[PDB]
């Protein structure tokens, strides 16, 4: 049921999604090991992901969360990076998209920093990099990220350097506690709490 609609670069919606992508790049403590070395992206395409069944599944769960949290879904737009982007946009987030070994347990992880999500496009730790050149810093190969609508509800705050949310919570927030420039990361434990709104196709750009 999924259809992908291309956004024009002239469309204010393309422009606002690109700006979120570029402006949330940071440097990473791995010196670029996982995601590559870059300060910005070449955005090749932004597509809107339309699936009525998946949207309705999202909004049903969103209303449930809202009603459990004083009518406040605490909805965010966050990035997700995964080698499984094609399954996600066709069948929704589910248990197969969980990061079993994550710092906050087996859940589906999202980031404010697009460059954090970029570290996961080719697998955990960047895997072996692009399939064509086996390069985690490949500047040729097209990469994809999702920019997603995520319901956090009441989020459990973790200060830090398939499972369940903590009792009475709907998500977990990983607050950055040493790296002063890192933005927050978030984990949900139910696939229905996220909708993959935008598919962004890009390259990382080699710094000059
Ligand atoms: C920590 C973390 C993980 C992400 N994706 C994991 C995708 C995945 C899931 C399962 C296997 Cl096996 C490989 C890759 C992610 N995206 N944006 C921010 N994060 N943060
Ligand atoms: Na939960
Ligand atoms: Zn490559």
Swiss-Prot record:
| Protein's cellular compartments | Cytoplasm; Golgi apparatus membrane; Nucleus; Chromosome, Telomere
| Ligand binding (Zn(2+)) | 130, 133, 138, 141
Domain PARP catalytic, chain residue ranges per copy: 8-208
Q: Summarize what the UniProt record says about post-translational modification.
A: Ubiquitinated at 'Lys-48' and 'Lys-63' by RNF146 when auto-poly-ADP-ribosylated; this leads to degradation. Deubiquitinated by USP25; leading to stabilization.
The tissues where this chain's protein is expressed are given as: Highly expressed in placenta, skeletal muscle, liver, brain, kidney, heart, thymus, spinal cord, lung, peripheral blood leukocytes, pancreas, lymph nodes, spleen, prostate, testis, ovary, small intestine, colon, mammary gland, breast and breast carcinoma, and in common-type meningioma. Highly expressed in fetal liver, heart and brain.
Function comment: Poly-ADP-ribosyltransferase involved in various processes such as Wnt signaling pathway, telomere length and vesicle trafficking. Acts as an activator of the Wnt signaling pathway by mediating poly-ADP-ribosylation of AXIN1 and AXIN2, 2 key components of the beta-catenin destruction complex: poly-ADP-ribosylated target proteins are recognized by RNF146, which mediates their ubiquitination and subsequent degradation. Also mediates poly-ADP-ribosylation of BLZF1 and CASC3, followed by recruitment of RNF146 and subsequent ubiquitination.
Assembly and partners are described as:
Oligomerizes and associates with TNKS. Interacts with the cytoplasmic domain of LNPEP/Otase in SLC2A4/GLUT4-vesicles. Binds to the N-terminus of Grb14 and TRF1 with its ankyrin repeat region. Interacts with HIF1AN. Interacts with RNF146; this interaction leads to ubiquitination and proteasomal degradation. Interacts with NUMA1.
Tell me its family.
Belongs to the ARTD/PARP family.
Protein name listed in UniProt: Poly [ADP-ribose] polymerase tankyrase-2
* Lineage start: Eukaryota, Metazoa, Chordata, Craniata, Vertebrata
Q: Which gene is this protein's source?
A: TNKS2
- Tell which residues of the whole protein are contained here: 952 to 1161 of 1166
